[PDB]
Design a protein around this ligand. Structure first.
Ligand SMILES: Nc1ncnc2c1ncn2[C@@H]1O[C@@H]2COP(=O)(O)O[C@H]2[C@H]1O
Ligand SMILES: Nc1ncnc2c1ncn2[C@@H]1O[C@@H]2COP(=O)(O)O[C@H]2[C@H]1O
Ligand SMILES: Nc1ncnc2c1ncn2[C@@H]1O[C@@H]2COP(=O)(O)O[C@H]2[C@H]1O
Lengths: 82, 84, 90
């Protein structure tokens, strides 16, 4: 019941593209919340729970490779108990 | 100092008052709600409830899941954090 | 391939947005995220999330906000750890 929580915080423009990467990669779902900040609720925070670290890592590695340079994004991973 | 538990519940908006009732009636210090959307559209809510005792978190959790999980789209998980 | 970073959360009334933001930046944080929130102790609270690679940085921010506002406003704070890619700077 120990799963991994992937977080992606990125510009709101990427809502469909990032949720595509999540859905296709095989995640059972995702959560998304409106967010603001610096680095106006112009961003979104993705939360993807996955049964395996490797899946979380694969989603993050694709999102980062495709979008980290041309859009402002951060991402991190933690573990939770389900 | 002091390790507390973070119970997260994600359910749809209409359970807001019934779930908050369960949290308060279980004797939690309080709770935090954020608006959220997702797939498993922004008419779901995310509860976060922090508790000194994993006991308290687990009861609140089972009582919510018993009453509503089968009939409503709903997820939950627990982690630990460091409070003051 | 991963590095430990600390995540500081502060939940306060929305009116404290400008003051708390300024305390985060003045301590040298690379950034912060804010979400709108409601709760009990409609979305008239705010949740800050501040990631940093030094627990000392997180401790300074937390100590200053607690000292300044936790008497006069209803707030909570906590800290946990997360993992980030080494390639990223926090
Ligand atoms: N794997 C997952 N990761 C993160 N959030 C999820 C996951 N599965 C379900 N959820 C959340 O739980 C909610 C249940 O109802 P919804 O499908 O409307 O929206 C869902 C998401 O917000
Ligand atoms: N035990 C708890 N778990 C989660 N959040 C809390 C808890 N106690 C207080 N809070 C949050 O702290 C906030 C302080 O102001 P409010 O009472 O408006 O709303 C409160 C909640 O958002
Ligand atoms: N150190 C940090 N802690 C928390 N959030 C951050 C940090 N750095 C950047 N962010 C978030 O990542 C977002 C990236 O785009 P923005 O610059 O619009 O706003 C940023 C913040 O919301």
């Amino acid at each position: 019941q120990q799963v991994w929580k992937l977080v992606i915080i990125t510009e709101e423009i990427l809502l469909k593209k990032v949720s595509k990467i999540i859905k296709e990669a095989g995640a059972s779902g995702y959560t998304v919340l409106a967010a603001a900040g610096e680095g106006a609720y112009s961003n979104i925070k993705f939360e993807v729970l996955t049964a395996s670290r490797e899946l979380a890592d694969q989603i993050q590695d694709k999102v980062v490779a495709k979008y980290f340079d041309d859009y402002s994004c951060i991402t991190y991973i933690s573990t939770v108990e389900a």
